[PDB]
Amino acid sequence: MGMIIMVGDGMGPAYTSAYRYFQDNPDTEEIEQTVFDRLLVGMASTYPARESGYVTDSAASATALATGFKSYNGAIAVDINKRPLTTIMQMAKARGMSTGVAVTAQVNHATPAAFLTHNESRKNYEAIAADMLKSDADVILGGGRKYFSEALVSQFSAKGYQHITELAQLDSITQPKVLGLFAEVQLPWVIDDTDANTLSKLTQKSLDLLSQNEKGFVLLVEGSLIDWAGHNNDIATAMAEMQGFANAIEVVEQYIRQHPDTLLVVTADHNTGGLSIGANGEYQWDTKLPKGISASPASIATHAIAADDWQAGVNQQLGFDVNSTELQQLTNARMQGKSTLEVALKKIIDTRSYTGWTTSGHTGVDVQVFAMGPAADLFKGNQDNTHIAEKMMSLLPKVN
């Protein structure tokens, strides 16, 4: 059977709840269900191994999801004693099934890394990239050109991989073994791109290849930038990444309607930023304003710094006109640089929209577990994140 594990990096309960309200049609009376609402089946604890406290990082959480083992923050498929653990992908391969990963961050980032490689530290990018050549994964799509040298790519070409760097080349890929690196590091923010279908395209392509194996497959799809946006406390950019992730989930749903013998599992590796729908004593979340933001605070700050006359440009991208107080704040910030300007912009956006945050890091709240397919009910209720791995693994073909 086919299997798809989708991870909304840093997508705690607030993110999915926010997405519903953000996408709510202001003209329709009721609030329309989102794909998350339709697929919710349970929740999961995200804590790492005891020695790391109660707040996990992406490496530890991904390790739990791919191996069913807890481990220290930073660990990449190795246990607390740095012993390499068998990932579900290895189990799949050992069973002659196809495997793959499609993400928006570098293909060698923590999450995908924990599914295809083993390393005592997530910081070892080049070694992890090289180790991926041992996984023999059929599909590797995402960013991270910076981490693969001409010589490494050559080794990948020798083992039968087709190397591509432009989305325009996807159409010509119709056979297993593809290494697609579509960006130096992470792919472009959805809010600043031509549309929100890039992750969906990598997903649809993965399914097209993987599904040609009668024995089945295990595909990992990660909405990696939800987390990055969360760290930046960037709500407008976060919601855009949420749409990109939701579109991909839709891609898989359609696939399942056409391939009934499949299991889809969607979850978060952890929560990021402490996002809150409503803030500062305000009992409301102004979604009308966010929808009007057509660019990332970074994009808006870059432009504002490059233009002599920038004020009109900022209001045009924010979707509203800044007042005198906020104008002076953008003015001072601009003199101090791009970074300080972005922060100034996000402060205005957050104050205007009543969006809250508690940290630039992670938080420990349990995340949601979603699923679709015959075995969906195995993931009902509360469970630890490691249990998600054990369940998916229990569906793989018999030992003999």
- Both tokens of 366, joined, read 């349990």
Helix (H, G, I), strand (E, B) or coil at 128: helix
Nearer to Mg ion, 264 or 277 (CB): 277
Please choose, out of 25-33, 121-129, 170-178, 179-187, the segment that lies near its own copies by the rule CB under 8 A: 25-33
Nearer to its own copies, 2 or 356 (CB): 356
Please choose, out of 19-27, 206-214, 220-228, 249-257, the segment that lies near Zn ion by the rule CB under 5 A: 220-228
Q: What phi and psi, each to the nearest 5 degrees, are found at residue 294?
A: -105, 10
Cα distances from 185 to residues 103, 105, 106, 146, 250, in angstroms, run 11, 7, 5, 6, 26
Contacts with its own copies, 70-89, as mask; x by CB under 8 A: ---x----------------
The rounded distance, in Å, linking the Cα atoms of 144 and 324 is: 42
Helix (H, G, I), strand (E, B) or coil at 195: coil
The rounded distance, in Å, linking the Cα atoms of 340 and 144 is: 27
Nearer to its own copies, 29 or 166 (CB): 29
Binding test (CB under 8 A) with its own copies, winner from 32, 53, 160, 185: 53
Shortest distance in whole angstroms from residue 100 CB to its own copies: 29
* E strand map for the chain: 2-7, 40-45, 98-106, 139-143, 162-164, 178-181, 217-222, 262-267, 271-272, 276-277, 355-356, 362-363, 367-372, 381-384
Q: Please report, as residue ranges, which positions from 29 to 48 form the binding site for its own copies (by CB under 8 A).
A: 29, 31, 33, 36-38, 40-43, 45, 47
Q: Please report, as residue ranges, which positions from 258 to 287 form the binding site for Zn ion (by CB under 5 A).
A: 272
Cα distances from 97 to residues 193, 272, 297, in angstroms, run 34, 33, 43
Helix (H, G, I), strand (E, B) or coil at 202: helix
Q: Is 58 a catalytic residue?
A: yes
Shortest distance in whole angstroms from residue 286 CB to its own copies: 9
Q: Is 141 exposed, middle or buried (0-12, 13-18, 19+ CB in 10 A)?
A: buried
Q: Which residue is nearest to Zn ion (CB)?
A: 227
The rounded distance, in Å, linking the Cα atoms of 325 and 161 is: 56
Q: Please report, as residue ranges, which positions from 34 to 73 form the binding site for Mg ion (by CB under 5 A).
A: none
Binding test (CB under 8 A) with its own copies, winner from 2, 6, 16, 180: 16
Please choose, out of 109-117, 133-141, 191-199, 269-277, the segment that lies near its own copies by the rule CB under 8 A: 269-277
Shortest distance in whole angstroms from residue 135 CB to its own copies: 28
The rounded distance, in Å, linking the Cα atoms of 78 and 59 is: 10
The active-site residue out of 17, 45, 52, 58 is 58
Contacts with Mg ion, 222-261, as mask; x by CB under 5 A: --x-------------------------------------
Known binding-site residues for Zn(2+) equal 9, 227, 231, 269-270, 362
Q: Which residues pair with 272 in a beta bridge?
A: 362
Binding test (CB under 5 A) with Mg ion, winner from 164, 305, 365, 395: 365
Tell me, what DSSP letter sits at residue 273?
A: T
The rounded distance, in Å, linking the Cα atoms of 321 and 223 is: 32
- Residue 171 contacts its own copies per CB under 8 A: no
Intra-chain end-to-end CA distance of the chain, in Å: 17
Tell me, what DSSP letter sits at residue 26?
A: T
Q: What phi and psi, each to the nearest 5 degrees, are found at residue 277?
A: -90, 90
| Short-list 273, 277, 274, 237, CA closest to 360 | 273
Shortest distance in whole angstroms from residue 356 CB to its own copies: 3
Shortest distance in whole angstroms from residue 35 CB to Zn ion: 23
Partner from its own copies, Mg ion, Zn ion, none contacting 54, C-beta within 5 to 8 A by type: its own copies
With CB under 5 A, what is the number of residues at the site for Mg ion? 10
- Residue 185 contacts its own copies per CB under 8 A: no
Please choose, out of 8-16, 83-91, 129-137, 311-319, the segment that lies near Mg ion by the rule CB under 5 A: 8-16
Shortest distance in whole angstroms from residue 107 CB to Mg ion: 9
Shortest distance in whole angstroms from residue 45 CB to Mg ion: 12
- Residue 381 contacts its own copies per CB under 8 A: yes
Q: CA gyration radius for the chain?
A: 21
What is the set of active-site residues? 58
Positions in the binding site for Mg ion (CB under 5 A): 14, 105, 109-111, 224, 276-277, 363, 365
Q: Which residues contact Zn ion by CB under 5 A?
A: 227, 272
